[PDB]
Ligand binder design. Sequence first.
Ligand SMILES: Nc1ccn([C@H]2C[C@H](O)[C@@H](COP(=O)(O)NP(=O)(O)OP(=O)(O)O)O2)c(=O)n1
Ligand SMILES: [Mg+2]
Ligand SMILES: [Mg+2]
Ligand code: NA
Ligand code: NA
Length: 327
Amino acid sequence: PQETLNGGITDMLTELANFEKNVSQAIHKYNAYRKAASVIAKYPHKIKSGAEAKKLPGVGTKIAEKIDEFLATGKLRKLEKIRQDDTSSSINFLTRVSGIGPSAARKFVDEGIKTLEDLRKNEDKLNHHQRIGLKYFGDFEKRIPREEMLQMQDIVLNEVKKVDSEYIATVCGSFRRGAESSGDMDVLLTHPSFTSESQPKLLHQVVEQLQKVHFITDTLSKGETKFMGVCQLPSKNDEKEYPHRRIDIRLIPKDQYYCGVLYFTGSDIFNKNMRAHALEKGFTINEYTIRPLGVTGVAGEPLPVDSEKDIFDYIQWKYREPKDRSE
DNA sequence: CCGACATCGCATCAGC
DNA sequence: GCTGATGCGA
DNA sequence: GTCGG
Ligand SMILES: Nc1ccn([C@H]2C[C@H](O)[C@@H](COP(=O)(O)NP(=O)(O)OP(=O)(O)O)O2)c(=O)n1
Ligand SMILES: [Mg+2]
Ligand SMILES: [Mg+2]
Ligand code: NA
Ligand code: NA
């Protein structure tokens, strides 16, 4: 029930997580540190020893050692040192630009480019995605109040039906889990003339419409089944301008619609725990189709599903509402 | 001691 | 020209 | 880094 309880520790693991991801390029250590931080964050006691923390799932030998040091000194020497290392701190920060991953960030820092200022000086060395992530650096780190999400949802739902009233658009992600604020907007899309069976420009025409009314402002990537870009709420004539926001639109076949709603509603860790738990209950689920495993796991055919708890029963879990799907 | 920890679409690079 | 590998964010 | 084969 508390961030403050073991906050010194959970911050330590979060920092260590980011450096593995961005500097050491180890996505699973990043995931491992996060898991440890999470379960420790829900632990309703103030941890007194590393042996005490090791008891929790996700916490093992090394993190136990790290906790002992922190508790008996108040610092982590490995972390103190990596904090003050110019190269490692520069690589880490640069990855906060959308489009710049660990590879490119390491590349830029190697040739002397270490700040936003240096980036804004070297546009020739940037792909289109990166120029936009740089441009809207501040805004993309701002959270979106649910009030604005509802306003955003209004424009989207309106223009979708305006193109063709047989479309269905569902706003998923954290917004659908009911969160008070979101980091971006996720839009699920479907149309009767697109199933797992076979109208050519379904995604293009929705996007084209949203650009027409000046909702979508930039395009990070776009194809037949998926769009990633930037959007903006129009301002009140006297009042100031809104931040540019990240938006993703994806086109999913209608006959697989609900599995997509489940997945893109999330959450992140929740989907990992469902697909890790299907493999022990003789199932295997992705964003398209839950399939009943065979004996050695030979994957049967795509079942029917006409609501989200259909899936929860196949897998035999209690139907948790979206608001309870953080993990 | 050692591999799994999920897989996806799209931009861009490596190379025939 | 093309296919495939990689990086990236989800 | 953690878990389990
Ligand atoms: N790595 C990831 C990231 C997201 N997802 C699914 C669950 C996420 O809810 C859904 C959308 O990703 P997302 O926008 O990045 N996260 P989410 O919407 O949950 O929260 P926010 O960042 O928006 O606030 O993707 C996933 O399965 N694996
Ligand atoms: Mg979201
Ligand atoms: Mg998103
Ligand atoms: Na443990
Ligand atoms: Na980034």
